[PDB]
């Protein structure tokens, strides 16, 4: 929560959660050369209702005993076209570049693994003219970390995105006044040279959840950290759970 | 910042400018218990589990000139008396304390400045006593029986 | 052998005071002003607490009217050197009694009762002092007392119970005799088990075992406490409804009830008068509601416990002081007596009793029809044939005796299916 | 009065100071500049600032646009006069005559 | 109950004639609401209130009844239920609301110290317990008294109950072969 601090207690609140015994997708694709057309249908374009929850794997890869993190690029918006703002977080081996623009993005994009760089270039916009932004940043992630989270989801006109690399529970990244409604998402395939199974068996993974708001059991512990949470319509026992404010 | 509890209040703070951190209780509140004895100008106070210092420092800057400490609380306006018992009260203040009321009379008017309530033991139920042994004196008891009736 | 079981009665309960205007509007002059104009709300309220509290002190003086009535102490009796009569060790019962000790203690096994229960009388007392910081930050009676709800403390301390049962135990001990019928204990105890069947032979030569079984019980009900006795449940029970009655009071000052917050100082820092009004009003309402649900319930709760009450002074007096001619009263039946001790907020009374542990199958004659046509009947007994001789034994041990008049019921007639001994003409 | 005890009403300790709190030096929330910028949009295109982590009083907001009427609702206009909030949205378009 | 109906309840008049006098139906029905359910409140109190007596009334009513048939109409054997002990009988009378019961008690006025024995032990080892009552020592020989009027009698077999065996520390006396 905002600025608040709690300590060594359970807290009823409702929010912008996933459901308790839904499923995840790994939305992650990998090509060498070849784009397969049904890549981009409506299988893996989905909707963006009122947000996505997501869980990324952070794939690292090595040259020369130096490390190097990469994974797949989300982009979230309506239409795709430069007459509607469209919002892409792209990973950069550390650098976390978000950016909300008008973008002219091509019909089958992919972006390119830049440690041991593939057979194609990265394409997913063409765009010398510099168009309008609303919002342009770069924030840092730890290199080292195995899983990334994120937030993100809508209200009242405005974008909000929450992400953590330490851990499991997410803090406040960046909101964004829009006006618009985004309608879909996107994770785009990352085009690479050696990640297969017959290269050092590197996987791509992005699975992705819907959100909606509803009520929690949160535990925070004596340094105030989420460690136990509990949806309260998920089955009898999180009824009795909740219903008692209690974990047993 | 902010540190709050599940209930939604603000309990403790860190400042921006100094980096300090800080918890909040609130203020204290409470009332006041009043013993009073018909045709007096005045009732004794209670104040129920609070020390005197506290209550002539911090509740009260007014003329008190008699006040003491019991197990009850600050007693204001009475004597403290604990050592003598009453078996009927009609000021019983908790946990065994009475009030009880003595205007200094014609002839036994006392000319020491003091207050007619006097902070005393209540004591209702007794039992009888005898001056016999507890023991076989000789393997016979001693005992008390009636000759009269 | 002699068993031996305990069994809490429930005499009293924590007395709430409740300051309403404190309650629902605490410290803000707009609310007080408009509570003003709702009439007598407040005062009904506080009404009937003080009438219930004053019920609780009535029933309080009863009980402790029951256990002094008619007993006479020897004045020397001393409890730091009096405290065994009959090879029966009553150490652990009586607290201190004596003109060199000075009536400041408990008994040990109120000791024990008393330190597992956290909310005592005394506890609200000196959690209530530890009130102006918390003693380290915070707790809950500090934030139910600043919100206008308090324990008050019962007229009579514990103290005091406790020196009224301590002389209610002591009375049955020594030689007045108060309380075992102006015989001593172990007289009274062999009169109360041979008025179950049982001959005075067997309790003359078995004194010690009795004496034995006793301290056993004893020293197995103090040994007994341990987070499954019932008795033990039945006292936190009492304890633990008052908790939740007072934190789910404490909870209604955090309903909105229909305003636009549960809080009077952020519609004061947010509003104008004419419109701070009508989202005052409904946090008023709501909570002289709870309040008045409140008082009912504990209205009907003081008839249960003034039931429980009376029910109690029953067993001081017949079964402590005296011993009853009513069976299955106290106890179950081959019931022997009944201690007292002080619990929080009641009675706790030991029952002794009689236990048979082996038998033996025997062929018995309810009456025997003797020459000139009359009859004899057993009187708490039967009839039994031993070596081909007619003889008595008590109904609750066996043990054969010769047949007089002690043991019969003559008649000068006899019934028709009394069997026929024409050879008796005994003692 | 009857022989009796009595409980009276309740008092609280009296607060002795204040502690007042704001972070010094600021900038300025700008809001006339913004309100009395040249270029006035539509109803259908409403434009929106935020303003956030600044200074700005009602006074010289109101004494430097042209008020012809400033109503509130929810809130009282003499309770913004010494606050602080987290932020102030304001939306601005021109207004139709027949609407 | 009857101070309710002067009360406001948050209204602008505690009166219906006042309110009735002043405003129109659409507007008065929000100030008559407030009134009547703040007396529909005050009255369901008082029910409870009454709800509440009734039971403890019904607990004294039903001890009347327990010490009218076995007080005044017969005397049982319980001590300490009528009266204090040393009770003799009950009367009653109608009181208002009522009834008053008037026990009377053998109240003891002057007292005597005596030494008293609880048993003796006779010879053949037989034993005698004295029948409500104390086996004291008069003129150096054993004689029976009750226990609540000093008046030194013989021993005798409607004194005593009988024991073929006596215990430990009862008194041993062979000089008793009496009636
Ligand atoms: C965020 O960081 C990235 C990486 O450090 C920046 O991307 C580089 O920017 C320079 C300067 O324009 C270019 O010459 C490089 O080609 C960029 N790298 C890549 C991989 O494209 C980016 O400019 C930063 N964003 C902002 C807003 O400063
Ligand atoms: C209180 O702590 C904050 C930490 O956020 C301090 O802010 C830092 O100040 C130093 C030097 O002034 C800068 O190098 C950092 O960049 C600041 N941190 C951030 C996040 O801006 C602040 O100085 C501390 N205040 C005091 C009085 O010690
Ligand atoms: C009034 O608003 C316009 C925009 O509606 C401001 O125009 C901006 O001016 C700055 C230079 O001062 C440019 O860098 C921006 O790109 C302009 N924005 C647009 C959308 O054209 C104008 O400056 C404002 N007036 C004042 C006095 O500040
Ligand atoms: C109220 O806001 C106005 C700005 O709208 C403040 O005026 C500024 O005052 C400082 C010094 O007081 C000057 O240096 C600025 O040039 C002023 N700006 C303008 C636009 O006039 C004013 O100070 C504020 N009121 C108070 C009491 O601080
Ligand atoms: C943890 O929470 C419990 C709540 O019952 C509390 O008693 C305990 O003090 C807390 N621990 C710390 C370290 O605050
Ligand atoms: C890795 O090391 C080799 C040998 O030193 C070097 O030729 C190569 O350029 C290095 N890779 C990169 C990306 O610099
Ligand atoms: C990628 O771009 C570089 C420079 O524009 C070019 O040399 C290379 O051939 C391109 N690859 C493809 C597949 O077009
Ligand atoms: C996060 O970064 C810190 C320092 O860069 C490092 O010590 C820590 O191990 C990193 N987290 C993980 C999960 O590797
Ligand atoms: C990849 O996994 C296979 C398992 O079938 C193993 O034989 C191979 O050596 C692995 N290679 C690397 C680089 O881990
Ligand atoms: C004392 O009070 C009573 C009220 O019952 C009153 O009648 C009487 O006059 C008073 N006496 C004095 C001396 O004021
Ligand atoms: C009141 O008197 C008793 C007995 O004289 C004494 O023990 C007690 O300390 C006194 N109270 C105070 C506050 O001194
Ligand atoms: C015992 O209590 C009674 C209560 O009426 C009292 O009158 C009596 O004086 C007390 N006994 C002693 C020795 O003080
Ligand atoms: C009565 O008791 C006192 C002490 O309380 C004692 O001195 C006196 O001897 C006793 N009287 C008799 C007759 O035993
Ligand atoms: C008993 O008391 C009465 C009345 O005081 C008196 O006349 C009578 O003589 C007394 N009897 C004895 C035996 O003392
Ligand atoms: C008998 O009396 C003596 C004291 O005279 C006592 O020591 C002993 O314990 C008693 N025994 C029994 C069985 O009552
Ligand atoms: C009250 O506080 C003191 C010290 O602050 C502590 O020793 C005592 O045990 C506390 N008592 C209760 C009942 O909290």
């Known amino acids: 929560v905002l600025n608040r601090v709690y300590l060594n207690t359970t807290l009823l609140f409702t929010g912008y959660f996933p459901k308790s015994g839904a499923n995840f997708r790994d939305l992650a694709l990998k090509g060498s050369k070849y784009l397969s057309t049904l890549w981009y249908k409506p299988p893996f374009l989905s909707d963006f209702n009122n947000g996505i929850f997501s869980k990324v794997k952070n794939t690292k890869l090595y040259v020369n005993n130096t490390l190097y993190s990469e994974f797949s690029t989300i982009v979230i918006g309506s239409v795709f076209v430069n007459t509607s703002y469209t919002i892409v977080v792209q990973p950069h081996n550390g650098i976390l570049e978000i950016t909300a623009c008008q973008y002219t993005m091509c019909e089958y994009p992919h972006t390119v693994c830049k440690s041991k760089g593939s057979i194609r270039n990265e394409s997913w916009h063409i765009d010398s003219s510099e168009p309008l932004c609303l919002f342009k940043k770069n924030f840092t992630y730890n290199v080292s970390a195995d899983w990334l989270y994120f937030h993100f989801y809508q209200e009242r006109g405005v974008f909000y995105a929450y992400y953590a690399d330490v851990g499991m529970p997410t803090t406040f990244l960046f909101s964004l006044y829009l006006g618009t409604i985004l309608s879909h998402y996107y994770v785009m395939p990352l085009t690479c040279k050696a990640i297969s199974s017959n290269t050092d068996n590197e996987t791509l993974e992005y699975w992705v959840t819907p959100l909606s708001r509803r009520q929690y059991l949160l535990n925070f512990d004596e340094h105030g950290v989420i460690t136990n949470a509990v949806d309260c319509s998920s089955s009898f026992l999180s009824e009795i759970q909740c219903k008692t404010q209690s974990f047993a | ?149 | 052998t002699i068993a031996g079981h305990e069994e809490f009665i429930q005499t009293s309960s924590p007395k709430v005071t409740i300051d309403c205007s404190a309650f629902v509007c605490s410290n803000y002059a707009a609310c007080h002003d408009l509570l003003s104009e709702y009439g007598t709300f407040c005062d009904n309220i506080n009404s009937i607490l003080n009438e219930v509290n004053d019920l609780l002190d009535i029933t309080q003086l009863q009980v402790a009217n029951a256990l002094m009535q008619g007993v006479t102490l020897s004045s020397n009796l001393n409890t730091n050197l009096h405290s065994d009569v009959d090879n029966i060790d009553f150490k652990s019962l009586l607290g201190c009694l004596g003109s060199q000790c000075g009536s400041s203690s408990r008994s040990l096994l109120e000791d024990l009762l008393f330190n597992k229960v956290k909310l005592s009388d005394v506890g609200f007392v000196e959690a209530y002092n530890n009130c102006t910081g918390g003693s380290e930050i915070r707790d809950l009676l500090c934030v139910q007392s600043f919100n206008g709800i308090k324990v008050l403390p019962p007229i009579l301390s514990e103290t005091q119970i406790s020196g009224y049962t301590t002389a209610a135990t002591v009375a049955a001990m020594f030689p007045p005799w108060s309380a075992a019928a102006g015989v001593p204990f172990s007289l009274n105890v062999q009169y109360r088990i041979n008025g179950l069947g049982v001959t005075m032979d067997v309790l003359n030569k078995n004194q010690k075992l009795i004496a034995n079984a006793f301290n056993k019980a004893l020293l197995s009900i103090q040994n007994g406490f341990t987070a499954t006795n019932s008795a033990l449940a039945k006292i936190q029970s009492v304890v633990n409804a008052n908790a939740q009655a007072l934190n789910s009071l404490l909870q209604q000052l955090f309903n909105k009830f229909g305003a636009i917050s549960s809080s009077l100082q952020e519609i004061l820092s947010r509003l104008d008068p004419p419109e701070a009004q009508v989202q005052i009003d409904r946090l008023i309402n709501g909570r002289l509601t709870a309040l008045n649900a409140y008082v009912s319930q504990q209205l009907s709760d003081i008839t249960l416990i003034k039931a429980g009450a009376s029910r109690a002074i029953e067993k001081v007096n017949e079964c402590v002081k005296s011993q009853s001619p009513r069976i299955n009263f106290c106890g179950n039946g081959n019931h022997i007596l009944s201690l007292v001790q002080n619990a929080p907020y009641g009675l706790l009374f030991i029952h002794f009793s009689y236990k048979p542990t082996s038998f033996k199958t025997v062929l018995v004659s309810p009456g025997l029809c003797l020459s000139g046509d009359r009859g004899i009947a057993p009187k708490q007994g039967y009839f039994i044939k031993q070596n081909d001789s007619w003889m008595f034994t008590g109904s609750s041990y066996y043990y054969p005796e010769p047949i007089s008049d002690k043991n019969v019921v003559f008649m000068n007639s006899c019934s028709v299916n009394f069997t026929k001994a024409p050879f008796i003409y005994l003692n | 009065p009857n022989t009796g005890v009595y409980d009276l009403s309740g008092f609280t300790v009296k607060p002795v100071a204040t502690v007042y709190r704001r972070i010094p030096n600021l900038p300025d929330c700008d809001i006339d500049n913004w309100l009395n910028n040249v270029s006035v949009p539509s109803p259908l295109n409403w434009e929106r600032r935020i303003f956030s982590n600044c200074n700005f009083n009602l006074s010289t907001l109101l004494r430097l646009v042209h008020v012809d009427s400033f109503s509130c609702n929810n809130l009282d206009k003499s309770k913004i006069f010494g606050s602080c909030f987290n932020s102030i949205t304001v939306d601005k378009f021109a207004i139709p005559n027949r609407r």
């Open chain 2, 1 to 149: 910042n902010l540190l709050y509890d599940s209930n939604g209040n603000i309990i403790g703070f860190k400042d921006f400018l100094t980096n300090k951190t800080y918890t909040i209780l609130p203020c204290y509140s409470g009332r006041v218990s009043a013993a009073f004895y018909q045709n007096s100008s005045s009732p004794a106070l209670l104040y129920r589990n609070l020390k005197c210092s506290y209550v002539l420092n911090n509740i009260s800057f007014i003329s008190q000139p008699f006040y003491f400490d019991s197990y009850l609380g600050c007693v204001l306006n009475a004597v403290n008396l604990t050592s003598y018992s009453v078996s009927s009260c009609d000021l019983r203040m908790g946990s065994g304390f009475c009030i009880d009321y003595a205007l200094p009379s014609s002839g036994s008017a006392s000319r020491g400045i003091s207050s007619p309530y006097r902070f005393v033991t209540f004591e209702p139920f007794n039992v009888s006593f005898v001056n016999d042994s507890v023991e076989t004196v000789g393997g016979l008891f001693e005992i008390q029986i009636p000759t009269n009736f």
